[PDB]
Design a protein around this ligand. Structure first.
Ligand SMILES: CCCCCCCCCCCCCCCCSCCNC(=O)CCNC(=O)[C@@H](O)C(C)(C)COP(=O)(O)OP(=O)(O)OC[C@H]1O[C@@H](n2cnc3c(N)ncnc32)[C@H](O)[C@@H]1OP(=O)(O)O
Length: 253
């Protein structure tokens, strides 16, 4: 929660101590909401949810699928992305994503089972039969959408980007995959809209530069704007910016 307050501090442009309490509270409530919904989501009526929820400017994505190009959906950890996944499973069909191999492995199996029970194809980031960005590239070249959580990746291979005015690292995947396949790179946002769910697809990012860092920066900028729009719905309770890392963690990346 303290790191969350310190992160919202980045979000609202105030020192951590002055971030309104109500915002931190609302962010914690949205986070709790995420987990409460995640618990029960697999047992809900997905058809109904698919029929009754809407996505703003979804036609962006559809036209990409009609043009045979495939598509990369990159979004931050805001709202309920699993719900978005359900909406896409219901409105388009199964899609592919990737997940960190948490510890213990039994918990990883729990999560895989969970998302697979929502209808997603989930690739292990490490330890799978084949390398993930080959299956993903193959999914994209077959004109299918993939979804990637794309605002956090503090490893050596993560891309250094500016985010709310300070240095962080984001995964290279959306840009790498888009460059390699020509697939449309749509930013996405999910947030909580009252007792319902708000979701939107944004205009695709230009990949003509073929440069992962600029593109990841544009993506980051959009993420920053969308998070700026719904700060309480971005549950990033883990460290995000490089400056909040210890010297030992700053080293590993
Ligand atoms: C409303 C819309 C609906 C939206 C629905 C949303 C639903 C979302 C739900 C999803 C829930 C998710 C939960 C949260 C999960 C978040 S995890 C975030 C994942 N982020 C990623 O970017 C995933 C992609 N990961 C990768 O790309 C990594 O595997 C990479 C490739 C970056 C690792 O890089 P590296 O370790 O630095 O590799 P190197 O380039 O240093 O060299 C090693 C590998 O390079 C690879 N490589 C080099 N060039 C190349 C080369 N051009 N294309 C390939 N791969 C090469 C090469 O394969 C080689 O391996 P080898 O071939 O086996 O020896």
């Amino acid at each position: 929660p303290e790191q969350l307050r310190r992160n919202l501090a980045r979000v609202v442009g105030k020192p951590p101590a002055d971030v309104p309490d109500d915002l931190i509270r609302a962010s914690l409530a949205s986070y709790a909401r995420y987990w409460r919904e995640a618990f029960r989501l697999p047992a809900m009526d997905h058809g109904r949810l698919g029929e009754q929820l809407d996505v703003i400017d979804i036609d962006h994505l559809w036209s990409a699928l009609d043009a045979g190009r495939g598509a990369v959906l990159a979004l931050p950890h805001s709202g309920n992305w699993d719900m978005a996944g359900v909406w896409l499973v219901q409105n388009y069909g199964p899609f592919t994503t990737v997940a960190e191999r948490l510890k213990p492995e039994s918990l990883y199996r729990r999560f895989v089972e969970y998302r697979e029970s929502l209808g997603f194809e989930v690739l292990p980031l490490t330890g799978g039969e084949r390398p993930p960005f080959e299956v993903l590239a193959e999914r994209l070249t077959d004109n299918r959408p993939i979804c990637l959580m794309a605002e956090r990746d503090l490893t050596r291979s993560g891309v250094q980007v500016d985010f709310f005015g300070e240095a962080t690292r984001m995964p290279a995947g959306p840009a790498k995959l888009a460059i390699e396949t020509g697939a449309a790179l749509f930013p996405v946002h999910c947030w909580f809209e009252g007792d319902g769910w708000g979701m939107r697809v944004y205009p695709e990012l230009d990949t003509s530069s073929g440069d992962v860092t600029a593109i990841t920066q544009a993506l980051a900028d959009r993420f920053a704007a969308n998070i700026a729009t719904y700060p309480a719905d971005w549950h990033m309770l883990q460290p995000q910016w490089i400056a909040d890392l210890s010297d030992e963690r700053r080293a590993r990346l």
